[PDB]
């Protein structure tokens, strides 16, 4: 039973515990139970995998999970999403640097505590529901079935502090007819290290992250699948999830709407980053593999392709993709004897109304 604890600006205090047993009872199958807790998320799963579905090396694995998400604690317009479901996925190895995934999933979503807002209600209207705009004490449940696929490319020279090679992850999903929702969702992550000097102490890192999803036949993608940008892992110098559309709230009685700086996310995202890794200035004793220093330029955007700017002239056009946030700063990573250490200082030099600045960001971790 292995644990882990962490503390950072993006998710607060993280707790992790799990255990893995292979060849369970001499049957070939592997079993595991894993759980994670955030300031905004509690997650737990149970998996049973067969690495010999075919002699060719194809694996057939199952998953049973529950997830509780409290959007207010992630700094989004308030709502609660308690979900659970199952997943069956095949994994195909292609070569040393490539692998594929194909699977089917079921997921139930229980939504509650939705503070009425325009974009969120636009999705609900597309689902035939007509909840009041004056009551946060509401409820909406869905049951979906999905096809899931993924591709992983990885040819790095080493896992920790890579100096050369690229990493690419592609994931996609789409609902199967008969589900409640009708939509698709795709994401692309890339990272490319290029060494400048012969000794690989000066390195250029280029990272990209893309996401796009949309509904089918009148329906929209559910707001609880939105993408988010801003924070330590996307655009440093911005508070986690602040980048993109902000909530437009309905009035409360027990066309007059309220502006806000509460992020909500969007169904389209584009994030890029250029990082210049250098040797640490006074720590170059020739055994400096424990620290990595870099300067970076981050940028990203998140928009709502279904925002109807004409009906909401008094409020920004949240469908425009061109409001590109940008930042620049410094970062230090350290494999210290107390655990992994990462911190950065960044300044946003391109902001938009409502965006929340967070110049200093860090993450601390311990594994036992």
């Amino acid at each position, epitope marked *: 039973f292995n644990f882990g604890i962490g503390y950072g600006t993006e998710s607060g205090v993280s707790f992790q515990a799990g255990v893995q047993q292979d060849n369970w009872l001499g049957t070939g199958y592997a079993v595991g139970i894993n759980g994670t807790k955030n300031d*905004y998320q509690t997650y737990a799963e149970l998996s049973v995998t067969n690495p010999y579905f075919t002699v060719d090396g194809v694996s057939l694995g199952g998953r049973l999970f529950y997830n509780d998400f*409290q*959007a*207010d*604690d*992630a*700094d*989004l*317009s*308030d709502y609660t999403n308690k979900s659970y479901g199952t997943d069956v996925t095949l994994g195909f190895p292609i070569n040393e640097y490539n692998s594929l995934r194909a699977g089917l999933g079921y997921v139930h979503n229980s939504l509650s*505590n939705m*503070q009425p807002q325009v974009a969120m209600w636009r999705y609900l209207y597309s689902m035939g529901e007509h909840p009041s705009t004056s009551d*946060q*004490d509401n409820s909406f449940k869905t049951d979906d079935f999905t096809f899931n696929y993924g591709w992983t490319y990885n040819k790095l020279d080493r896992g920790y502090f890579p100096t050369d090679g690229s990493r690419v992850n592609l994931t996609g999903k789409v609902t199967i007819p008969g589900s409640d929702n009708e939509y698709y969702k795709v994401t692309l992550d890339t990272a490319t290290y290029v060494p400048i000097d012969d000794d690989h102490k000066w390195v250029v890192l280029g990272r990209t992250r893309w996401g796009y999803g949309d509904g089918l036949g009148g329906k929209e993608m559910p707001f609880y699948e939105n993408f988010y940008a801003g924070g330590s892992s996307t655009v440093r110098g911005f508070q986690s999830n602040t980048i993109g559309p902000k909530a437009v*709230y309905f*009035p*409360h*009685q*027990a066309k007059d709407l*309220s*502006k*806000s*700086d*509460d992020a909500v996310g969007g169904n389209a995202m584009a994030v890029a980053s250029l990082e210049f890794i250098t040797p640490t200035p006074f720590i170059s004793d020739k055994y400096a593999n424990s620290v990595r220093t870099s300067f970076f330029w981050d940028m990203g955007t998140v928009w709502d392709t279904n925002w109807d700017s004409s009906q909401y002239s008094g409020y920004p056009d949240y469908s425009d993709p061109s409001n590109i946030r940008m930042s620049a700063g410094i970062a230090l990573q350290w494999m210290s004897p107390l655990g992994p250490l990462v911190f950065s200082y960044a300044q946003p030099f391109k902001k938009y109304d*409502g965006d*929340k600045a967070e110049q200093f960001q860090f993450n601390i971790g311990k594994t036992w």
Partner: nanobody
Amino acid sequence: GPSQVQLVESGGGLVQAGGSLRLSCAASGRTFSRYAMAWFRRAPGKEREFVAAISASAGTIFYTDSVKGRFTISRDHAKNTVSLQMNSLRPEDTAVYYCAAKTGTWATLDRRYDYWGQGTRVTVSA
């Protein structure tokens, strides 16, 4: 000092129908986290209802239609201190006004807030 987060309401009292009152609320002790803060109220016969909220950044302000246009919620320059300026009051504003705090985004439901104050009485005479 206190053994937990404490919210202390100040202001309030007796005012004429068309008068004004300024309430305040402050998180006692030392809190290193920024809180969204809100005002609720419970009338003599009715149940506890929402009045106004303001985000931690103060960028989001929200009122119930009853008091919209008459009340004004604002964050003080100090840590986690909010005020509620109530103008053109009315006998239907009489109630115990409670202060509520919350880390993360604001909300209208009382169960979403993590800390509450003891409340202050507000009385409006016809």
